[PDB]
Amino acid sequence: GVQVETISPGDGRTFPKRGQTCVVHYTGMLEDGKKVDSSRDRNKPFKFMLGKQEVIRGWEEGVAQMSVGQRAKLTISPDYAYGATGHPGIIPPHATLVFDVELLKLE
Amino acid sequence: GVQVETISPGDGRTFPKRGQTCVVHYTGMLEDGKKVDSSRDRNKPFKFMLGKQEVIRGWEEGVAQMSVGQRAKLTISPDYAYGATGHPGIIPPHATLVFDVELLKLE
Numbered sequence: 743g744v745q746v747e748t749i750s751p752g753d754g755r756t757f758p759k760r761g762q763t764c765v766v767h768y769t770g771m772l773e774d775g776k777k778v779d780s781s782r783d784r785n786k787p788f789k790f791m792l793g794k795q796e797v798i799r800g801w802e803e804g805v806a807q808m809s810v811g812q813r814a815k816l817t818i819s820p821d822y823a824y825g826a827t828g829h830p831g832i833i834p835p836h837a838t839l840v841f842d843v844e845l846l847k848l849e
Numbered sequence: 850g851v852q853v854e855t856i857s858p859g860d861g862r863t864f865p866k867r868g869q870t871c872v873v874h875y876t877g878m879l880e881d882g883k884k885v886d887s888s889r890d891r892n893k894p895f896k897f898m899l900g901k902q903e904v905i906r907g908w909e910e911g912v913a914q915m916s917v918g919q920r921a922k923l924t925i926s927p928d929y930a931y932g933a934t935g936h937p938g939i940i941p942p943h944a945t946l947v948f949d950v951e952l953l954k955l956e
């Protein structure tokens with residue numbers, strides 16, 4: 743599943759609802775700490791809409807548990823991410839992924 | 850993931866909303882056709898509430914795509930069911946499950 747470790751607290755009351763656009767900055771890494779991708783390296787935050795199947799399962803479930811302003815480490819098992827196949831050149835097979843995620847705002 | 854094959858049509862309009870109780874009769878079986886369990890063998894239909902994590906993943910997603918009266922066969926991969934461990938005595942490890950499900954009503 744997805745495990746959540748809080749790094750910095752959010753407001754503790756404003757949580758994302760399906761249909762809302764989540765604006766976040768993230769760093770995705772393999773279990774051994776190696777960086778695969780990061781929005782912080784790109785000039786603009788990442789955005790997705792909750793409930794539209796726009797992202798891997800672990801993210802839908804994990805980010806829905808965060809409040810605005812919160813920063814957390816989400817540890818996602820393969821079955822909740824890219825599973826057996828992974829994704830060529832980016833994610834190896836059966837990979838557990840760890841994301842450092844910061845929920846900036848909802849829109 | 851979860852694949853849905855329709856066996857008998859439903860009303861094509863009444864679909865389960867998160868928070869509603871789905872009343873169904875089902876027969877679950879392994880990929881080779883052996884029956885593991887069936888509510889049709891038990892005197893009353895199976896009931897569960899959508900969106901409350903009461904059932905395996907594949908069911909939350911598959912039943913949500915059925916309308917009242919529909920009968921369908923849901924083929925669920927391990928990652929959407931019991932994964933690598935299975936469930937002692939009932940579901941073996943790495944089991945793909947096939948369910949014959951009939952959505953009787955919503956309440």
Ligand SMILES: CC[C@H](C(=O)N1CCCC[C@H]1C(=O)O[C@H](CCc1ccc(OC)c(OC)c1)c1cccc(OCC(=O)O)c1)c1cc(OC)c(OC)c(OC)c1
Pocket residue numbers: 768769770771778779788789790795796797798799801823824829832833
């Ligand atoms: C740590 C690397 C990272 C990743 O893992 N991230 C991205 C951040 C959200 C969580 C997760 C993801 O979910 O990234 C998805 C990957 C594809 C995907 C999508 C839905 C799935 O299922 C319902 C699924 O099933 C496995 C796989 C994603 C990507 C881009 C925009 C996205 O949002 C909407 C859009 O703008 O198109 C979504 C990643 C970034 C990519 O580009 C920034 C990317 O592209 C090259 C990619 O391909 C594997 C990986």
Ligand SMILES: CC[C@H](C(=O)N1CCCC[C@H]1C(=O)O[C@H](CCc1ccc(OC)c(OC)c1)c1cccc(OCC(=O)O)c1)c1cc(OC)c(OC)c(OC)c1
Pocket residue numbers: 875876877878885886895896897902903904905906908930931936939940
């Ligand atoms: C084909 C065998 C079958 C099964 O597979 N079925 C049952 C029908 C819904 C789909 C699925 C299920 O999901 O069955 C779950 C199993 C447990 C479970 C639950 C949530 C999970 O969350 C992701 C999860 O993760 C793996 C595992 C279930 C069971 C009973 C009531 C249930 O809910 C209503 C209630 O609480 O009364 C749920 C099964 C029947 C059982 O009893 C009738 C049972 O018990 C002995 C069982 O244990 C493995 C198997």
